[PDB]
Coordinates of C-alpha atoms and ligand atoms in Angstrom, one line a residue:
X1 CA -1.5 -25.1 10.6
X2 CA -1.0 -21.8 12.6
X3 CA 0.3 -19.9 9.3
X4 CA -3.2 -20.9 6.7
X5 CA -5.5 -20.7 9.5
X6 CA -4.9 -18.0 12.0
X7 CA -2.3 -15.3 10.9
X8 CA -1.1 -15.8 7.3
X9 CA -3.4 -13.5 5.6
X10 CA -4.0 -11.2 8.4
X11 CA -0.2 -10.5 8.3
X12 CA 0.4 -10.1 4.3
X13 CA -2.4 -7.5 4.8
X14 CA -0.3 -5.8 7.6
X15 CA 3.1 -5.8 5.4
X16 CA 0.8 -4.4 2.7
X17 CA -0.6 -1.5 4.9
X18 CA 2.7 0.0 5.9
X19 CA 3.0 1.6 2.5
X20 CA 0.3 1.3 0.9
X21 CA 0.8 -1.6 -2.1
X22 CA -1.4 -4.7 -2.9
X23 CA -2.4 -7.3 -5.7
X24 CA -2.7 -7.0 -9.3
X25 CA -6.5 -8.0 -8.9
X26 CA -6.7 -4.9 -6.9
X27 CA -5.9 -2.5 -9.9
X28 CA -5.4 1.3 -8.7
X29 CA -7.3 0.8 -5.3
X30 CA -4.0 1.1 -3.4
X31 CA -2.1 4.1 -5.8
X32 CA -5.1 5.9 -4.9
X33 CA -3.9 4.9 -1.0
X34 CA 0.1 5.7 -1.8
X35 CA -1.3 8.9 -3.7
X36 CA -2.9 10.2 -0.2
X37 CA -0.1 9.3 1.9
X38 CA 3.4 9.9 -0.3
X39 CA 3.0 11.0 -4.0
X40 CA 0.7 13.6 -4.3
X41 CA 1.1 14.7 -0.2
X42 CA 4.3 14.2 1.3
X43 CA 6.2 13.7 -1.5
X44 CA 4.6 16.4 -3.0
X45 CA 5.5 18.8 -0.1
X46 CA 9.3 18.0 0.4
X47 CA 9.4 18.3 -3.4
X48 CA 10.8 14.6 -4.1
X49 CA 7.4 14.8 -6.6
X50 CA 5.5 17.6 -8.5
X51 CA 1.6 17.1 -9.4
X52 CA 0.4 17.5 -12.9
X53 CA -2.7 18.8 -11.6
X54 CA -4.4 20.9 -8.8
X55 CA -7.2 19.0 -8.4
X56 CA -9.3 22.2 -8.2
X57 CA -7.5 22.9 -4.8
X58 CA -9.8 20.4 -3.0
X59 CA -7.4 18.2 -1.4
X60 CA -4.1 17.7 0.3
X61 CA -2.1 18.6 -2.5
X62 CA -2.6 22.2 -2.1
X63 CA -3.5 21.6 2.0
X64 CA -6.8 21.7 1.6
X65 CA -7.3 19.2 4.3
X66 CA -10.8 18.4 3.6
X67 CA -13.2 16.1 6.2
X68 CA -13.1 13.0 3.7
X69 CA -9.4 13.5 2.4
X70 CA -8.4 13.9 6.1
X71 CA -10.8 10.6 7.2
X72 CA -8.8 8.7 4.0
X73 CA -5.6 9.7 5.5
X74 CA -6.5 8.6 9.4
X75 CA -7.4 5.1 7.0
X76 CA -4.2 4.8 5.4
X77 CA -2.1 5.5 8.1
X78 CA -3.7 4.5 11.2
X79 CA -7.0 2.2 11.0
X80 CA -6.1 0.2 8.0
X81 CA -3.5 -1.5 9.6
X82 CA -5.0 -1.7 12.6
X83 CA -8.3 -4.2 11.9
X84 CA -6.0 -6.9 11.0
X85 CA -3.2 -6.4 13.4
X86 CA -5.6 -6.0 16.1
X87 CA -7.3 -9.9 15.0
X88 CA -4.0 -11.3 15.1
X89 CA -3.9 -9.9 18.8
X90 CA -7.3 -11.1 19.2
X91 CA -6.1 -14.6 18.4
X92 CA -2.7 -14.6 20.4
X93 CA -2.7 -12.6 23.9
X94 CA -3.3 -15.7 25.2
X95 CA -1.1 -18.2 24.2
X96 CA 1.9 -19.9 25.8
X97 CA 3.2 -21.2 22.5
X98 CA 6.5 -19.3 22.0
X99 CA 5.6 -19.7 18.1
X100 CA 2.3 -17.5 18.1
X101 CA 4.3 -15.4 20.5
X102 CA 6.8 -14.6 18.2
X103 CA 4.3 -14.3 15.5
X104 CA 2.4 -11.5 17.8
X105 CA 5.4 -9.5 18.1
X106 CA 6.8 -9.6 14.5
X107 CA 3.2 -8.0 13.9
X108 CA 3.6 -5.7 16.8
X109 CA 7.1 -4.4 14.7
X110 CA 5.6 -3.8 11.8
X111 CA 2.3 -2.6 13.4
X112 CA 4.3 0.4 14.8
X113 CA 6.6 0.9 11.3
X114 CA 3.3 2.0 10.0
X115 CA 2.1 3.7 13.5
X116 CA 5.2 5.5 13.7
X117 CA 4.4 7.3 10.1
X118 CA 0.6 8.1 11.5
X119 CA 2.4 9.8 14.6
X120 CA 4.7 12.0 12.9
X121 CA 1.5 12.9 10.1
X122 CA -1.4 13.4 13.0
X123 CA 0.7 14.3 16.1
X124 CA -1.5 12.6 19.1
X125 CA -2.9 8.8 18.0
X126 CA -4.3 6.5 20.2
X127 CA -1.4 4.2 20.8
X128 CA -1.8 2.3 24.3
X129 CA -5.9 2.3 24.2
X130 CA -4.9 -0.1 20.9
X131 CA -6.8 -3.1 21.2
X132 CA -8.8 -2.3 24.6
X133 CA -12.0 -3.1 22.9
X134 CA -13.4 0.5 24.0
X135 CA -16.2 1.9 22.0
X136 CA -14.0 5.4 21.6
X137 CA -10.4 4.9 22.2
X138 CA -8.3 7.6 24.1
X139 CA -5.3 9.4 22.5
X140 CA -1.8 9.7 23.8
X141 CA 0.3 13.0 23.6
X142 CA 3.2 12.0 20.6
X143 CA 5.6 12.2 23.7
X144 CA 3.9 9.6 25.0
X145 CA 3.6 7.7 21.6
X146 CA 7.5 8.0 21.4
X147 CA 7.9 6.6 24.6
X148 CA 5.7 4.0 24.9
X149 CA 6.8 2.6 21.2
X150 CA 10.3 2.7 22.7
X151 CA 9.4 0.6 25.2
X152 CA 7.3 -1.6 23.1
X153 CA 10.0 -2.4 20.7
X154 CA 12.7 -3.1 23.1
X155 CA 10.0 -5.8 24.1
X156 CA 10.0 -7.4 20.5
X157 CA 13.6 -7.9 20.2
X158 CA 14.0 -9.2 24.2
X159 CA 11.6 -12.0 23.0
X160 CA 12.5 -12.3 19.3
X161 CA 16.5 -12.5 20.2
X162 CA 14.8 -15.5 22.0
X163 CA 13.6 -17.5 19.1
X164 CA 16.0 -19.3 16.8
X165 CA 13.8 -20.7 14.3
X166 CA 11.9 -19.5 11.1
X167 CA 8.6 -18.0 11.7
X168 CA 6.1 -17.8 9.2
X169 CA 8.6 -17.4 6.1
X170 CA 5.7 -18.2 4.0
X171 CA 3.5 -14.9 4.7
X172 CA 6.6 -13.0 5.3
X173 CA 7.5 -10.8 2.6
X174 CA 9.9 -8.5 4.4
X175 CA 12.4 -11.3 5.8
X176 CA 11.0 -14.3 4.5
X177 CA 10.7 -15.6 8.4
X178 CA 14.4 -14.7 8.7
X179 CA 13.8 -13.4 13.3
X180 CA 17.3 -12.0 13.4
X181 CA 16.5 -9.7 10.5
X182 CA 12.9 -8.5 12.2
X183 CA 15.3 -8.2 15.3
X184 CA 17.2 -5.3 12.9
X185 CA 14.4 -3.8 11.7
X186 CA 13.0 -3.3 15.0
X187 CA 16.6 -1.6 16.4
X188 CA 16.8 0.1 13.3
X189 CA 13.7 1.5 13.8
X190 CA 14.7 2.6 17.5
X191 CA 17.8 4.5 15.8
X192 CA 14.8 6.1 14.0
X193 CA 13.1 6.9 17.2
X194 CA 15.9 7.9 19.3
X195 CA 17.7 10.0 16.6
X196 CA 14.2 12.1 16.1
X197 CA 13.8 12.9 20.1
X198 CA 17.4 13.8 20.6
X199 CA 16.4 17.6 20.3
X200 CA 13.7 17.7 22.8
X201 CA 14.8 14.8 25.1
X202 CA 18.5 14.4 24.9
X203 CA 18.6 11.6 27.5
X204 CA 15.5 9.6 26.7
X205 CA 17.7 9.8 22.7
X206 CA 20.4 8.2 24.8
X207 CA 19.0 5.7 26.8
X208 CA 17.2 3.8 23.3
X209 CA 20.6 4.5 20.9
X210 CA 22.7 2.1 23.5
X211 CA 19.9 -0.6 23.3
X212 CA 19.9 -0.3 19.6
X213 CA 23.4 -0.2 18.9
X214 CA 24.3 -3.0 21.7
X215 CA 25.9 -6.2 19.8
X216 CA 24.8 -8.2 22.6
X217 CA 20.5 -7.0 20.8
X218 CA 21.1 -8.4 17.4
X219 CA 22.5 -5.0 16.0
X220 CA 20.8 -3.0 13.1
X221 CA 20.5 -3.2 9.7
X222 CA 23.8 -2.5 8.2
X223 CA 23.8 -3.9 4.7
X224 CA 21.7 -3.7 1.2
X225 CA 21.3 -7.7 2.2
X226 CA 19.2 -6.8 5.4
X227 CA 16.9 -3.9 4.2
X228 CA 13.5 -3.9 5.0
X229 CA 11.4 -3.4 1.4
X230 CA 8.3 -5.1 0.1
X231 CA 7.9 -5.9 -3.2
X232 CA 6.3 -8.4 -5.7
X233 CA 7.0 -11.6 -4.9
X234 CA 5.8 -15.6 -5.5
X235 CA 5.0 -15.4 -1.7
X236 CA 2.3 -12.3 -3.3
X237 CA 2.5 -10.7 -6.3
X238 CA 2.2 -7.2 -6.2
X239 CA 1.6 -4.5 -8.8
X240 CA 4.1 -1.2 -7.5
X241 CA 1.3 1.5 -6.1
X242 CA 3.2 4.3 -7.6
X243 CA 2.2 2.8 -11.1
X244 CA -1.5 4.4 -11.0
X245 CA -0.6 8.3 -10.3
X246 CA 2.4 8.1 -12.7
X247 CA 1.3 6.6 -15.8
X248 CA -2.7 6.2 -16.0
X249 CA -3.2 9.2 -14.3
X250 CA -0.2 11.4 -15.4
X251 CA -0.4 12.9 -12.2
X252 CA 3.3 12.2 -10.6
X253 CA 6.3 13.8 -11.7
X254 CA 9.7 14.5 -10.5
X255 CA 9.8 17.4 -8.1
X256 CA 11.6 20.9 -8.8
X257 CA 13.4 19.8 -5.1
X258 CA 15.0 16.7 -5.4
X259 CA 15.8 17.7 -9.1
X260 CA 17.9 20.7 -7.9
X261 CA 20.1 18.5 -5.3
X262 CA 20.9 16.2 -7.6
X263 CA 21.2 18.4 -11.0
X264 CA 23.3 20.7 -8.9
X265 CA 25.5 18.0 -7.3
X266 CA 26.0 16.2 -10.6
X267 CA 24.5 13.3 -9.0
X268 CA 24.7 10.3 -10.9
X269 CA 21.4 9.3 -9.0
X270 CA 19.6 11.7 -10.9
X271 CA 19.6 8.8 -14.1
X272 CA 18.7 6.3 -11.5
X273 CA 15.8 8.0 -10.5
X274 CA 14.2 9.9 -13.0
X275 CA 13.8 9.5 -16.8
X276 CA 14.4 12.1 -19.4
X277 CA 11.0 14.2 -20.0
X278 CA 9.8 15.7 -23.4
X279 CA 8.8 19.2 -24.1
X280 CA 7.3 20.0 -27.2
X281 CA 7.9 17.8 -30.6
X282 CA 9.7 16.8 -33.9
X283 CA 12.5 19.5 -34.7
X284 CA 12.0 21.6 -31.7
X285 CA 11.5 19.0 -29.1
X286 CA 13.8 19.4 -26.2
X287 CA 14.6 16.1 -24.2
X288 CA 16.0 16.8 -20.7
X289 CA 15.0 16.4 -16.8
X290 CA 12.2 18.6 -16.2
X291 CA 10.9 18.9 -13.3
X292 CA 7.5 19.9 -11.9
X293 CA 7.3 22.8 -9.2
X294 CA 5.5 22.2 -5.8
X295 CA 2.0 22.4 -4.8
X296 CA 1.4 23.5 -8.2
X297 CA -1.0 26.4 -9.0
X298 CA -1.4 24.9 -12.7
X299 CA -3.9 22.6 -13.5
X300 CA -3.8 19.3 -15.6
X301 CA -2.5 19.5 -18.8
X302 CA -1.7 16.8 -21.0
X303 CA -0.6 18.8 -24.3
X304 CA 3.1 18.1 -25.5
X305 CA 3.9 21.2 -24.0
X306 CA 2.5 20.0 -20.7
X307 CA 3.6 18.4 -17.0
X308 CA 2.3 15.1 -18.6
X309 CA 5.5 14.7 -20.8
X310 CA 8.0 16.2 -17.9
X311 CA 10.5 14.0 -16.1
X312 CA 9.2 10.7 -14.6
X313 CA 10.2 8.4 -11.3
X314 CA 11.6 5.3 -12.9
X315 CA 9.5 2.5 -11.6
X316 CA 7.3 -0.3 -13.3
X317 CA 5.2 -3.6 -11.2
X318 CA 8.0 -4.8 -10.0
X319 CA 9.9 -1.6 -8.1
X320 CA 9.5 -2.5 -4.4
X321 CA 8.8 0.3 -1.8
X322 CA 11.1 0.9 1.1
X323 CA 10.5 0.7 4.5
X324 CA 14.4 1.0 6.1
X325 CA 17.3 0.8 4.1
X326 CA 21.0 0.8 5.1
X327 CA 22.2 4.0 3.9
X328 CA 19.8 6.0 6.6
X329 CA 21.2 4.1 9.1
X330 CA 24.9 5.5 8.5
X331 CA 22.7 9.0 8.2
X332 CA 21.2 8.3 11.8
X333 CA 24.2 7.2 13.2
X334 CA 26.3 10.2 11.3
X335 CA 23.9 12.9 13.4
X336 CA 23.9 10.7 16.3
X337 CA 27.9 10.8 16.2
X338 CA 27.5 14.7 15.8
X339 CA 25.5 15.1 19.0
X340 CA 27.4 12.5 21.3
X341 CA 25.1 9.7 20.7
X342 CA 27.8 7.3 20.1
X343 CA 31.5 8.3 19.1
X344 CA 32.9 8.4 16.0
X345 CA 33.6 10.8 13.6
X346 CA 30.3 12.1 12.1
X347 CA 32.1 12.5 8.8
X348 CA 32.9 9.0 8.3
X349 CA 29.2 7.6 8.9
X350 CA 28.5 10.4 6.6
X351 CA 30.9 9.5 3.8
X352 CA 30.2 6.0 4.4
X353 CA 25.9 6.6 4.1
X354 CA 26.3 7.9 0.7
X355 CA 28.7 5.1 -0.5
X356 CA 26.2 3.0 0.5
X357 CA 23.5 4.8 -0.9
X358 CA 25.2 4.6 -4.3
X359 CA 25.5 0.9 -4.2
X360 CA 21.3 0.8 -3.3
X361 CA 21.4 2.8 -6.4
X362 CA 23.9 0.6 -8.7
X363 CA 25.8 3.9 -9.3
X364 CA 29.1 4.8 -8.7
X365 CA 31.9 7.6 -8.4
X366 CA 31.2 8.4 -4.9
X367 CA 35.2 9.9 -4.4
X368 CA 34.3 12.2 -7.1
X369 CA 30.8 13.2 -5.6
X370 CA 32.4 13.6 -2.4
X371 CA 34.4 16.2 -4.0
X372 CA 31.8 18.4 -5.3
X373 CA 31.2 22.0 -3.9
X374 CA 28.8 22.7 -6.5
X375 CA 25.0 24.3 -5.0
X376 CA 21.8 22.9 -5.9
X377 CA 20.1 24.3 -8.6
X378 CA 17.6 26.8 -9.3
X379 CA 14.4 27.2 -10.8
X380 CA 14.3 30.5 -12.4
X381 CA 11.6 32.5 -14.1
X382 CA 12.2 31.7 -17.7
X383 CA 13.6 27.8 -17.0
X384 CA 10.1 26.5 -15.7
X385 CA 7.9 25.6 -18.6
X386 CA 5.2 24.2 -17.1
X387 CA 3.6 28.1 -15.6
X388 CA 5.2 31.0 -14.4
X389 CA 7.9 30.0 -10.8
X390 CA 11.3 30.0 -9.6
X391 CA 12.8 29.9 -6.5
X392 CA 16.8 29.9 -5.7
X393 CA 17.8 26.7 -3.9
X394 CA 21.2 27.9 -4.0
X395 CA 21.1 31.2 -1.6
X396 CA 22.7 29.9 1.7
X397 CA 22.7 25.8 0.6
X398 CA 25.6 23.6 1.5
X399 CA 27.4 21.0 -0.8
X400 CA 28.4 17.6 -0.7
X401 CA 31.9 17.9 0.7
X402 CA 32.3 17.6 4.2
X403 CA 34.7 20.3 4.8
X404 CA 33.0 22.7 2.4
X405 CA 31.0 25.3 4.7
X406 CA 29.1 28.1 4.0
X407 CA 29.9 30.3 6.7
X408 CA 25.9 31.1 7.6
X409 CA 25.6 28.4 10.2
X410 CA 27.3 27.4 12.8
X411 CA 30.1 24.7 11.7
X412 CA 28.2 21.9 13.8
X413 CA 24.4 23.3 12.2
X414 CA 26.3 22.7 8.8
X415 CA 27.3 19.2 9.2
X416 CA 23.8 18.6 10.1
X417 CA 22.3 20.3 7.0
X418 CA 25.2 18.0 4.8
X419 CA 23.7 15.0 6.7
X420 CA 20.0 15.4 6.8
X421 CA 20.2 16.8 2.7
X422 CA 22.3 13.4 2.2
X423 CA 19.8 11.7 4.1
X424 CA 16.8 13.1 2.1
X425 CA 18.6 11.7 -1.1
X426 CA 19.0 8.3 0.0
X427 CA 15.8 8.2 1.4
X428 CA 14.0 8.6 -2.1
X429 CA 11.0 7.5 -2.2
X430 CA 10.1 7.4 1.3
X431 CA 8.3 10.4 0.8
X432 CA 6.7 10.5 4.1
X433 CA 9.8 9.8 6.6
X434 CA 11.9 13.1 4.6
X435 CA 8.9 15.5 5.4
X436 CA 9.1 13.7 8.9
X437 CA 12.5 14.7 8.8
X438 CA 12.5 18.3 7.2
X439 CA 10.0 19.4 9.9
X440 CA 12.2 18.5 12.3
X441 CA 15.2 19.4 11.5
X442 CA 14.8 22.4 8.8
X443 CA 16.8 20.6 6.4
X444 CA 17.3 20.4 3.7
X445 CA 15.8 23.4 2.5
X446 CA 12.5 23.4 -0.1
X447 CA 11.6 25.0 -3.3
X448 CA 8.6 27.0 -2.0
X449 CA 5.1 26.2 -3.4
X450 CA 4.0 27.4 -6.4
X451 CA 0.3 27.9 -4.9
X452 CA 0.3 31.0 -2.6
X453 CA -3.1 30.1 -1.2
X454 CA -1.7 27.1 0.0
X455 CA 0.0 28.6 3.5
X456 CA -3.7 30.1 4.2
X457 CA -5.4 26.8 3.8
X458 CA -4.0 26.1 7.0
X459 CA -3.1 28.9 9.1
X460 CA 0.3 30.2 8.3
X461 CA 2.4 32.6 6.5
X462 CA 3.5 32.1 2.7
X463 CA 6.4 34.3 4.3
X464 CA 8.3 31.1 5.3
X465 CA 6.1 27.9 5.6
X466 CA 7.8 25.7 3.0
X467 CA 5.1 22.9 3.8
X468 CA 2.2 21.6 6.6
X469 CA 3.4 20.9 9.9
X470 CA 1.2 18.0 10.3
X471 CA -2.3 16.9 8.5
X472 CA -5.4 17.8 10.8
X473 CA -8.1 15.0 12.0
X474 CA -11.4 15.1 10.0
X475 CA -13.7 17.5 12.0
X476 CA -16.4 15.0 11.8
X477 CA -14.6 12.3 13.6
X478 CA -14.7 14.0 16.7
X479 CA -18.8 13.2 16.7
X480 CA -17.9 9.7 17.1
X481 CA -15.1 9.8 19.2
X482 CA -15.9 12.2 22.4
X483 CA -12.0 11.4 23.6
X484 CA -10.8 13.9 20.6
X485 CA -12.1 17.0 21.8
X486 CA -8.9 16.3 23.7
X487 CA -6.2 16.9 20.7
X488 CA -6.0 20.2 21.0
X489 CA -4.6 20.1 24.5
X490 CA -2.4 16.8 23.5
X491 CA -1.0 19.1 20.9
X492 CA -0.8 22.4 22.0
X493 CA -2.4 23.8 19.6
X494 CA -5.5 24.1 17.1
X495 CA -5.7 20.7 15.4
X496 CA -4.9 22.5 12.0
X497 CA -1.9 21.8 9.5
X498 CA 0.4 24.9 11.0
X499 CA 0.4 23.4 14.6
X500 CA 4.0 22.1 15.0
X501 CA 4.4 19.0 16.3
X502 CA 6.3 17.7 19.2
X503 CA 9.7 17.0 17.8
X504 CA 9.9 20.3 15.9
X505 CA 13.4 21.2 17.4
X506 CA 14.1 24.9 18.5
X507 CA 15.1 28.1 16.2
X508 CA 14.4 25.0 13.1
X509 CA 16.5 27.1 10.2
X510 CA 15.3 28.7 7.6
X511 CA 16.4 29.3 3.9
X512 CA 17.5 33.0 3.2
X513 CA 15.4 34.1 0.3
X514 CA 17.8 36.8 0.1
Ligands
LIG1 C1 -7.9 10.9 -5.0 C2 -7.5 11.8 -6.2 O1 -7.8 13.0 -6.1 N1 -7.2 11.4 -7.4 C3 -7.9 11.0 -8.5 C4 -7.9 9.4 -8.5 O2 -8.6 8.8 -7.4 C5 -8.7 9.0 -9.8 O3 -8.9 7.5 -10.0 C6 -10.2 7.1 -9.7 O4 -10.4 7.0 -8.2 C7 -11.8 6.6 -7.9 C8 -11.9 6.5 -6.4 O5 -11.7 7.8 -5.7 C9 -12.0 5.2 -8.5 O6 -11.1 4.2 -8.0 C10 -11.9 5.3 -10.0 O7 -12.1 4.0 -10.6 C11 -10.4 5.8 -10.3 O8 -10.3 5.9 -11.8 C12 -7.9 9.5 -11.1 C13 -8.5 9.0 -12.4 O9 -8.0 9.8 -13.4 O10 -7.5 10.9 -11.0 C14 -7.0 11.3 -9.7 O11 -6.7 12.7 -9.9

């Protein structure tokens, strides 16, 4: 009935769109997608990847934000999802049936998952001119984005907590039609949202947290049995988009970042993640985690000597891609304990986040790792293979153990630092919400690019940009759309990648290069 005919297909493609992932039959159409947005980007940028190539420093892997790369990204983050969202709207505004009600606003969650992800790429986006039919839609200021999604997602679960019966379970491949666990997502999601404003708006954080948090709203996602990931599936097979870039193109590798948390923490996530890389062959063939610096200078090599035999993220056709897991709940709730968002003592949510994270991971030996004072690692000068780079992650870097400070931050800026460079390791791969995250809060700190040209591509200083501050709309799109000569203004700035965005919190920390 409602599910073949109306919505079904229309809301696979939305679960789809949110991270970009699709059908075998599709081949490497959507890891050229997660390739834009996560691997060769933002994962790219926070480090959690390093690119076997430079693609000539034409794209947005060395911030050349070109017109078409820029008009891709818009796509994948923003319009893509919006055609069939905006159909099933379309279709349901005008219904009384509770059913295609509750069908509307498990689209309207998901439709803002992926929206959310556009904000905190592109700053301004039009958010409440969504669906208005208008020729050129208007843009909202990403304060007003915050709020009004806020807002909008406290409406979903009001009308969801409603509804007591499965809904669509055969196009759902989040929840399989499961309401109370789209009722978590959505809260879950407003932890997300509230945690991210506390800086700038303190009290708009605090009036969303309670909402989120309240028992009496269906709660939040607080075990590995209610996280939100999409994967292959007899509901719709699904070939992992990560597949293209890291084997057929030998493009994705692990990043010199992530590899320097977790060598230098003797984290036993570092097996779970990453596979063992070669360098050279025969006698002399070293086999160890190598890691590929950022923005890298160097380009594609595929000798047995090169990137293309380095250290690779362990994932085949059927890995699934994340969207909310439990351990960044604990994380959310650990900083929002640490700034009076709820009580509690930051440093059990803390403790408790990576436990969790370990279990997501099948790994174990948390007391131990909890222990550990150990610093990230380097990357030195004669240590990186792949082309001449180091960089110190150590200088001024915190460790895993709670009571372990550092003495260059304040005791309260430390705690942060432990929990946002926790938070960055559980949130592996979700490339896109860490360098969300980093911008905001400075932590944890980067290996610097290996490009030096990169910072100018922009319009900023190699001095201390560590990464973009945002991507910048296609030029172009501004011809068809007279409501962008607006942006500017909406951001406060040149729409170019070293404009800071609106959560940027003040005096954001900076590594000592020493
Ligand atoms: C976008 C980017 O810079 N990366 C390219 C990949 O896109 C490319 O794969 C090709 O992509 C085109 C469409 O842009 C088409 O789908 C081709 O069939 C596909 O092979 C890849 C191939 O080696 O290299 C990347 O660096």
């Amino acid at each position: 009935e409602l599910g073949p005919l109306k919505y079904g297909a229309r809301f696979m493609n939305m679960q789809q769109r949110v991270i970009p992932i699709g059908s075998p039959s599709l081949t490497t159409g959507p890891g050229n997608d997660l390739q834009n947005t996560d691997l060769i980007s933002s994962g790219n940028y926070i480090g959690y990847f390093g690119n076997n190539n430079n693609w000539g420093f034409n794209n947005e892997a060395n911030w050349n934000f070109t017109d078409s790369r820029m008009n891709y990204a818009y796509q994948n983050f923003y319009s893509q999802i919006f055609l069939p969202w905006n159909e099933i709207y379309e279709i349901a505004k005008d219904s009384d049936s509770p059913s295609e009600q509750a069908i509307l606003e498990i689209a309207n969650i998901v439709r803002n998952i992926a929206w959310l992800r556009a904000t905190d790429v592109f700053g301004p986006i039009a958010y409440n001119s969504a669906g208005d039919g208008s020729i050129a839609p208007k843009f909202d200021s990403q304060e007003v984005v915050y709020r009004s999604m806020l807002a909008d997602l406290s409406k979903s679960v009001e009308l969801l907590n409603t509804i007591s019966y499965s809904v669509m379970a055969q196009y759902d491949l989040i929840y399989n039609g499961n309401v109370q666990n789209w009722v978590k997502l959505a809260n879950s999601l407003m932890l997300r949202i509230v945690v991210r404003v506390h800086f700038i708006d303190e009290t708009l954080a605090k009036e969303y947290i309670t909402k989120a948090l309240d028992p009496k709203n269906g709660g939040v996602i607080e075990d590995i049995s209610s996280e939100a990931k999409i994967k292959s599936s007899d509901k719709m097979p699904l070939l992992n988009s990560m597949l293209a870039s890291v084997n057929e193109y030998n493009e994705t590798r692990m990043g010199a970042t992530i590899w320097g948390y977790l060598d230098g923490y003797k984290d036993p996530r570092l097996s779970a993640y990453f596979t063992e890389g070669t360098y050279g062959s025969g006698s002399w063939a070293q086999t160890g985690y190598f890691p590929v610096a950022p923005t890298n200078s160097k380009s594609k090599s595929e000798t047995s000597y090169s990137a293309k035999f380095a250290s690779r993220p362990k994932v085949d056709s059927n890995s699934p891609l994340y969207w909310f897991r439990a351990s960044e709940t604990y994380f959310l709730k650990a900083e929002a304990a640490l700034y009076n968002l709820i009580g509690g003592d930051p440093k059990t949510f803390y403790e408790q986040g990576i436990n969790i994270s370990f279990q997501e991971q099948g790994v174990s030996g948390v007391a131990t790792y909890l222990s550990g004072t150990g610093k990230p690692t380097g990357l030195t000068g004669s240590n990186y293979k792949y082309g001449t780079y180091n960089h110190d992650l150590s200088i001024g870097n915190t460790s895993p153990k709670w009571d372990d400070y550092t003495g260059n931050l304040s005791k309260q800026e430390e705690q942060l630092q432990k929990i946002i460079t926790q938070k960055y390791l559980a949130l592996y791969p979700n490339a896109v919400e860490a360098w969300t995250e980093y911008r905001r809060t400075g932590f944890p700190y980067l290996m610097k690019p290996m490009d030096e040209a990169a910072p100018g591509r922009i319009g900023a200083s190699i001095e201390d940009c560590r990464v973009p501050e945002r991507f910048r709309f296609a030029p172009t799109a501004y011809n068809s759309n007279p409501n962008m000569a607006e942006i500017p203004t909406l951001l406060g700035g040149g729409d170019i990648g070293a404009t800071k965005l609106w959560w940027v919190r003040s005096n954001r920390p900076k590594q000592p290069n020493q």
